Amino acid sequence: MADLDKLNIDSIIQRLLEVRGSKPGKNVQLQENEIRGLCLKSREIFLSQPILLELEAPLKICGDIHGQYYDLLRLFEYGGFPPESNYLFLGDYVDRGKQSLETICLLLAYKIKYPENFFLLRGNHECASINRIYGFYDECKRRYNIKLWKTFTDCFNCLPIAAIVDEKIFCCHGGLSPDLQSMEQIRRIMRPTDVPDQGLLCDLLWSDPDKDVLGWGENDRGVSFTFGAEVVAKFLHKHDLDLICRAHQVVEDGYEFFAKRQLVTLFSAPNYCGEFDNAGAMMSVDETLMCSFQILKP
Amino acid sequence: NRPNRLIVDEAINEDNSVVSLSQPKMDELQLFRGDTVLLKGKKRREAVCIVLSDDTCSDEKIRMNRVVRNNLRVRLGDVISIQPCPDVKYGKRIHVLPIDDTVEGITGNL
């Protein structure tokens, strides 16, 4: 971004590359005035874009990084580091651990240097509240003070919500929703925003692509409305949609194609909580809307 | 007629939207130091500004700067009525344009 901001962005990129291929947990901190200016610029840029973004084909969209610096670095090394490749996370981009801050800083730096080669989203694990995602709020409270935490929360609330790949594949966090009607109210819903417990964005971030329901029902979050196969099919038919991205789940195969290859549940969460050996994967979207399952380590 | 038409005195401050109002002026009128009131000028010249609290800079006369007088098309000592202007909200899409005689020389996005 700015001269000091761009220098800090280059330094953070170099630090992440030096921490690439190694154990996760990078932080990538900064100064006080410089970080305040960078956060203000990032909030302004993210709020500048609409809630419904559009991807630039081709791109290497990853699954749920779960706030892992090692996973993000591996995706950058394999799927293409920024700004050499466009990245679009489906959701759950931040989670428990001290490695989500580095990924967020890298994404912000890439967007500042090239907004057409950087994108990320939040799900049930990367929510703005510590009730659903304490891997950010509690981490900031323990490490940093409250002013920087408030600035980060405001910047995150000033971010976009969804993305689309050539109007072919929907880059959603989880599954469909019964509350989502059209894009007119989505683009109208500007900053600020957050993942709720129930509704449409709540079902996108917390719920996953449901098949036991038809129009609406309960979800894994317990309050979300995991729209069933019928609701997703009706939404795709009305909106001429073909694919929807799913994340925020422990995928044993990483990338699962659901709804007859219409819900690519790509998840980049390797070894979720250790016990759940969830596989990592990415959605390699080519220039001709060719969705490929780029699996990764578990 | 009405007491609200206070004399438009001269303001020592160069701020355009600031009028040095007497303690009696700020008190008898509902004029706080941060009250956005509307002043009506000649030929339907209405504007909203701030009322500064300066008892020593006003004696029953609204000390107004020359910029304020020029913008409002009013002279010195004018009995200008002042009314509250709390309906002034943020504009949606306000069209603006510089003055050719005034933007002549200031190059770039001035």
């Binding site: 302004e44 | 949606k92 306000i94 344009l97």
Partner: peptide
């Protein structure tokens, strides 16, 4: 002269 058509001076 136009309204809400040019990119404005963002702060």
């Amino acid at each position: 002269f136009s309204g809400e058509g040019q990119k404005l001076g963002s702060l």
